[PDB]
């Protein structure tokens, strides 16, 4: 649990695209404590509302016909967020890459450690706000 670091595990199995996020609360909300005031209350609500749009946090090509099947959000109060997302991509052959928008929604994240398991290969890469491409 390192502030500014986010864990990203992507699994691709047939039409199943599963992405899991482990993010410190400092990255997602801007602080890991109980909301002191209304500003912080809004920060938390904005975050939680953002976390249920993995289709905004991960740019999936329309051609891949990716539909959201699962949105799980776990907040543990330090403080941590786990999000687990499942897409069913009816043209998964056309999902060449994912362009993560994480750094745009949560700019206090500096690096994501991405693990990508597909039918063909495991691969790792470190992402930043400028290098957001994941190849499948
Ligand atoms: Zn929403
Ligand atoms: Zn912490
Ligand atoms: Zn299918």
Residue numbers in the entry: 35 to 111, 123, 185 to 242
The authors write:
Thus, the ZrgA proteins appear to represent a newly discovered family of zinc SBPs widespread among Gram-negative bacteria, including human pathogens. Here, we have determined the crystal structure of ZrgA from Vibrio cholerae and characterized its zinc binding in vitro and function in vivo. Here, we show that ZrgA likely functions as the SBP for the ZrgBC permease/ATPase transporter system as it is required for normal growth and survival in zinc-deficient conditions in the ΔznuA background.
Since zinc-bound ZrgA would not crystallize, zinc was soaked into crystals of apo Δ124-184 ZrgA to acquire the holo protein structure at 2.41 Å resolution. We also acquired a dataset at the zinc absorption edge to generate an anomalous density map, which allowed us to model a total of 21 zinc ions into the asymmetric unit. These fall into 5 different binding sites. Sites 1 and 2 are observed in every chain with strong anomalous density and relatively low B-factors for the zinc ion. Site 1 is coordinated by the previously disordered His 35 and His 37 as well as Glu 66. Site 1 is conserved in PA4063 where a fourth His aligning with His 184 in ZrgA coordinates the metal. Site 3 is located at the opposite end of the protein from site 1 and is coordinated by residues His 49, His 194, and Glu 196. Further, the loop containing Glu 66 moves approximately 4 Å to allow zinc coordination.
